[PDB]
Design a protein around this motif. Structure first.
Motif, short mmCIF file in Angstrom:
data_model
loop_
_atom_site.label_atom_id
_atom_site.label_comp_id
_atom_site.label_asym_id
_atom_site.label_seq_id
_atom_site.Cartn_x
_atom_site.Cartn_y
_atom_site.Cartn_z
N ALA A 129 0.80 -1.22 0.00
CA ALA A 129 0.00 0.00 0.00
C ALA A 129 0.83 1.26 0.00
N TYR A 130 0.22 2.35 -0.43
CA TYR A 130 0.84 3.65 -0.33
C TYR A 130 0.57 4.18 1.08
N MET A 131 1.62 4.18 1.89
CA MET A 131 1.49 4.46 3.31
C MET A 131 2.12 5.79 3.64
N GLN A 132 1.64 6.39 4.73
CA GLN A 132 2.38 7.40 5.45
C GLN A 132 2.84 6.75 6.72
N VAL A 133 4.16 6.71 6.92
CA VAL A 133 4.73 6.15 8.11
C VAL A 133 5.17 7.33 8.97
N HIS A 134 4.41 7.56 10.05
CA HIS A 134 4.68 8.66 10.96
C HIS A 134 5.73 8.17 11.96
N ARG B 10 5.70 15.80 5.41
CA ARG B 10 6.12 16.87 6.32
C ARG B 10 7.12 16.30 7.33
N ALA B 11 7.89 17.18 7.96
CA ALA B 11 8.84 16.74 8.96
C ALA B 11 9.12 17.93 9.85
N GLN B 19 8.60 23.05 18.98
CA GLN B 19 8.90 22.75 17.58
C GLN B 19 9.75 23.88 17.01
N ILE B 20 11.03 23.59 16.76
CA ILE B 20 12.00 24.61 16.38
C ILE B 20 12.24 24.73 14.88
N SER B 21 11.67 23.80 14.12
CA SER B 21 11.91 23.72 12.71
C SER B 21 10.87 22.76 12.12
N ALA B 22 10.38 23.07 10.92
CA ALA B 22 9.48 22.18 10.18
C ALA B 22 9.54 22.48 8.68
N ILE B 23 9.35 21.45 7.86
CA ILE B 23 9.11 21.58 6.41
C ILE B 23 7.82 20.87 5.97
N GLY B 24 7.36 21.18 4.76
CA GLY B 24 6.29 20.42 4.10
C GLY B 24 6.90 19.31 3.27
N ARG B 25 6.36 19.11 2.07
CA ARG B 25 6.86 18.05 1.19
C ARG B 25 8.32 18.26 0.81
N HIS B 134 10.19 14.46 13.97
CA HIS B 134 8.94 13.93 13.48
C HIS B 134 9.05 13.79 11.97
N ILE B 135 8.93 12.56 11.48
CA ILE B 135 9.15 12.30 10.05
C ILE B 135 7.92 11.60 9.48
N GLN B 136 7.21 12.27 8.58
CA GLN B 136 6.07 11.62 7.92
C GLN B 136 6.60 11.07 6.63
N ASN B 137 7.10 9.84 6.70
CA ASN B 137 7.73 9.22 5.56
C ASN B 137 6.65 8.86 4.54
N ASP B 138 6.79 9.45 3.35
CA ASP B 138 5.79 9.44 2.26
C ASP B 138 6.01 8.25 1.31
N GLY B 139 5.29 7.15 1.55
CA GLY B 139 5.45 5.95 0.71
C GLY B 139 5.35 4.63 1.46
#
Ligand SMILES: [Mg+2]
Ligand SMILES: [Mg+2]
Lengths: 150, 149
Positions: A129-134, B10-11, B19-25, B134-139
């Motif tokens: 699946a296409y996931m978001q892994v937080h 995002r991360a 929260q001292i730093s953040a990015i989007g995609r 915080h890492i929202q790993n995309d995939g």
């Protein structure tokens, strides 16, 4: 076999905004299975993950306790991109095991992990699946593991 | 020099709850400075990271576009634990560059990233600090990079 292991205060997997799984304190493992991977590497990688000393003891000494010592959780997600070859700048994934066999291998891998540790403390993403892994990486602490060379 | 690159939706970085730093995609880069790293490895690593084709094109074709192609963001955090475990079951630091010399290299690396890309699209953690990244790993999509050898 390759793995990227991140120490987490929490972690979760979403698919389309639907929460699939979540862990508290423990470890998130991104698992890269190669074509040449066998039962030996499967068993060796499980042992390494379970015994990896990424946690503190009560005094606060670093690198003294594994996930199992702490009775913490493990979130595993299949990640073929770790089996990447970098000719030019485009990734090529010829060394990664194809998904038909890889799903079976992954499932067997998760099952060895559960039987060697505790099933209820092992969580998974959703293989296809296409996931978001937080990943809330605690430190951060990030370790690269490989088993062809254990 | 070693890096773990994660494609993110995002991360962010928190220290002491703030929260001292953040990015989007874009990408979150965890960067490990090794003992015998030189300006040479540093420049090569910046180049590799900036052209790594981990993004889709506008037709959805996988593995076709870099962070710069997409005009996306980069969050870079220092991470000395990326060296080989080899023996024992703990992080191995004997191959990592001592924090003193390493901090200079890390800052040089960020300045190179900024000079070669867009400074306003580059964020970092806080070198000294105990961070939650915080890492929202995309995939997810995760790539290991290495220079010297
Ligand atoms: Mg991980
Ligand atoms: Mg990363």
């Amino acid at each position: 076999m390759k793995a990227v292991v991140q120490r987490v205060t929490r972690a979760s997997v979403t698919v389309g905004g639907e929460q699939i799984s979540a862990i508290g304190r423990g470890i998130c493992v991104l698992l890269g299975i190669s074509l040449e991977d066998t039962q030996k590497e499967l068993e060796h990688m499980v042992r390494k993950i379970l015994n990896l000393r990424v946690f503190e003891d009560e005094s606060g000494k670093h690198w003294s306790k594994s996930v199992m010592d702490k009775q913490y959780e493990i979130l595993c997600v299949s990640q073929f991109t770790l089996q990447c070859v970098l000719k030019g700048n485009k990734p090529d994934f010829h060394l990664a095991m194809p998904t038909e066999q890889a799903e079976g291998f992954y499932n067997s891998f998760l099952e060895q992990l559960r039987k060697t540790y505790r099933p209820e403390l092992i969580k998974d993403g959703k293989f296809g699946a296409y996931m978001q892994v937080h990943i809330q990486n605690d430190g951060p602490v990030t370790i690269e593991l490989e088993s062809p060379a254990p």
